[PDB]
Design a protein around this ligand. Structure first.
Ligand SMILES: O=C1c2cccc3c(NCCO)ccc(c23)C(=O)N1c1cccc(Br)c1
Ligand SMILES: [Mn+2]
Ligand SMILES: [Mn+2]
Length: 531
């Protein structure tokens, strides 16, 4: 069960890769320790390969089997349909990698005969050949981070593995309707992707408050995708086949798991053979649903193994939160050790071992945590934050560069209630949109796995719908939260919060004087700045 087998061949780039922040005049006003902000490249690909390559041992027991039976019973109440070639094309992402067979994502979306003809041929092949492993390409991702001191520092580039565009569209034809419906039915309230930030918070908080003495922990699996075995991917297929599906859907799902999901060969961007995969591919339709199902399965079983009492789970990828009743500090510590023992048997050991927590604010998963502030009436309001280091580092990058993804705008939307998105991100970018003549100009923005064309002036209305009117009135943030933000600004050389407020006082006035919907932005987004 070796997760990967490699050959000499290198994981290679497809174009120029920048690894370092530039020196913009605008960038330095946000952030002045510019040697801390980097970007992964193929140069580090080999370090990542080393980490993600190991033999997997997996030993199942009745806890696993009992949970899996309960899951299949739930799956058996799901019905799902085939998408037609046309529906799958229309649901294809705008900016996904072009096909080797002469068409790209925009051709797919506009139902180009070239795309449609090819996808029909790929479908027929999936139905008629259930064995030939399907080609994939492997690439090192280009993501922006901030360096860490106390940790090792510089992370290697993540690896992505994906089949051709044509195959990706067939995946949607066979499984889009499954992957969109099945998870919620099987996992119910534990299925994290159903929640907006406020609803996730509402779930964790009501869950937390229902225990007499609450204890929670997060868990995150070391190299999760590599820990996923052929057993795991076959179990997944067996859950999908519990569904009520069309005959042709069944055939394509079985075929896709034999030819693609289970494993297959890996090829370079130059066309060379890099090796063989026997674990989860990170770039298939089924990655998110599969990781979530498999993490839930193993974690549910592992909670029974550790005898955790009145457990409640929340799962996104391999990102897991558990909230249960405390048995006491030494009891909880021992239980956690037994929880990760079971998980490790099931093949999924943790990056860092979990730690029991008695303060909900201190539980981090999906890079996020719950925290408290007060609304205009002084009432306690709970909301989702995260450490602002990465959002700021990518904000500094996107100030100095094009970027067809606007992570700053995604962060303002998702984290609109936070101290840091309000004082720093909203101020910095409205200042730049004010100086350039560009308040009316729509921007591309990737959030919750989709690409939106966002008018900056729509932000008041977006934030209100997503978070509610309170997002414009929060005050009296937690000492821990305030602390973390201030210490992150010092670490990165971004100006302290008192500077951001002055700049925002001026940003607010300039928006107000500009009159219409610009002034609406000034009122709502920056009401915090003016007494
Ligand atoms: O406006 C400030 C502010 C201005 C200047 C300095 C500080 C501040 N001092 C930084 C010490 O590290 C801490 C918190 C806030 C703050 C702080 O929480 N706020 C604030 C109050 C209400 C809403 C919002 Br958004 C921010
Ligand atoms: Mn992980
Ligand atoms: Mn994770």
């Amino acid at each position: 069960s070796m997760s990967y087998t490699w050959t000499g061949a290198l994981i290679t780039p497809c174009a120029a890769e920048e690894s370092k922040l530039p020196i913009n005049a605008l960038s330095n006003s946000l952030l002045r320790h510019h040697n801390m902000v980097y970007a992964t490249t193929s140069r580090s690909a080999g370090l990542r390969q080393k980490k993600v390559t190991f033999d997997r041992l997996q030993v199942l027991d009745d806890h696993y089997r009992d949970v899996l039976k309960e899951m299949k019973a739930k799956a058996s109440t799901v019905k799902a349909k085939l998408l037609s070639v046309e529906e799958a094309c229309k649901l294809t992402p705008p900016h996904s990698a072009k096909s080797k067979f002469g068409y790209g994502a925009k051709d797919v979306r506009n139902l180009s005969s070239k795309a449609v003809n090819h996808i029909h041929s790929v479908w027929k092949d999936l139905l008629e050949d259930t064995v030939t492993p399907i080609d994939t390409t492997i690439m090192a991702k280009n993501e922006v981070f901030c360096v860490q001191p106390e940790k090792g520092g510089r992370k290697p580039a993540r690896l992505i593995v994906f089949p051709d565009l044509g195959v990706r569209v067939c995946e949607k034809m066979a499984l889009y309707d499954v992957v969109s419906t099945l998870p919620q039915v099987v996992m119910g309230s534990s299925y994290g992707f159903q929640y907006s930030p406020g609803q996730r918070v509402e779930f964790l908080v009501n869950t937390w408050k229902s225990k007499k003495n609450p204890m929670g922990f997060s868990y995150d699996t070391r190299c999760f995708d590599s820990t996923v075995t052929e057993n795991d991917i076959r179990v997944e297929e067996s859950i999908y086949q519990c569904c009520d599906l069309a005959p042709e859907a069944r055939q394509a799902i079985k075929s896709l798991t034999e030819r693609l999901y289970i494993g297959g060969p890996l090829t370079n961007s130059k066309g060379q053979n890099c090796g063989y995969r026997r674990c989860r591919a990170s770039g298939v339709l089924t990655t998110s649903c599969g990781n979530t199902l498999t993490c839930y399965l193993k974690a549910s079983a592992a909670c029974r193994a550790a005898k955790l009492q009145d457990c409640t789970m929340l799962v996104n990828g391999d990102d897991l939160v558990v909230i249960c009743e405390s048995a006491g500090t030494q009891e909880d510590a021992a239980s956690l050790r037994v929880f990760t023992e079971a998980m490790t048997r099931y093949s999924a050991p943790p990056g860092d071992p979990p730690q029991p927590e008695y303060d909900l604010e201190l539980i981090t998963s999906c890079s996020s945590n719950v925290s408290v502030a007060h609304d205009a009436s002084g009432k306690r309001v709970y909301y989702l934050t995260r450490d602002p280091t990465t959002p700021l580092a990518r904000a500094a990058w996107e100030t100095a560069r094009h970027t067809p993804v606007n992570s700053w705008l995604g962060n303002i939307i998702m984290y609109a209630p936070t101290l840091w998105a309000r004082m720093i991100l909203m101020t910095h970018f409205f200042s730049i949109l004010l100086a350039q003549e560009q308040l009316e100009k729509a921007l591309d923005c990737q959030i919750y796995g989709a690409c939106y064309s966002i008018e900056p002036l729509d932000l008041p209305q977006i934030i209100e719908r997503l978070h509610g009117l309170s997002a414009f009135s929060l005050h009296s943030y937690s000492p821990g939260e305030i602390n973390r933000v201030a210490s992150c600004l010092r670490k990165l050389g971004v100006p302290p919060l008192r500077v951001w407020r002055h700049r925002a006082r001026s940003v607010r006035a300039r928006l107000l004087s500009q009159g219409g919907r610009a002034a609406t932005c000034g009122k709502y987004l920056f009401n915090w700045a003016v007494k």
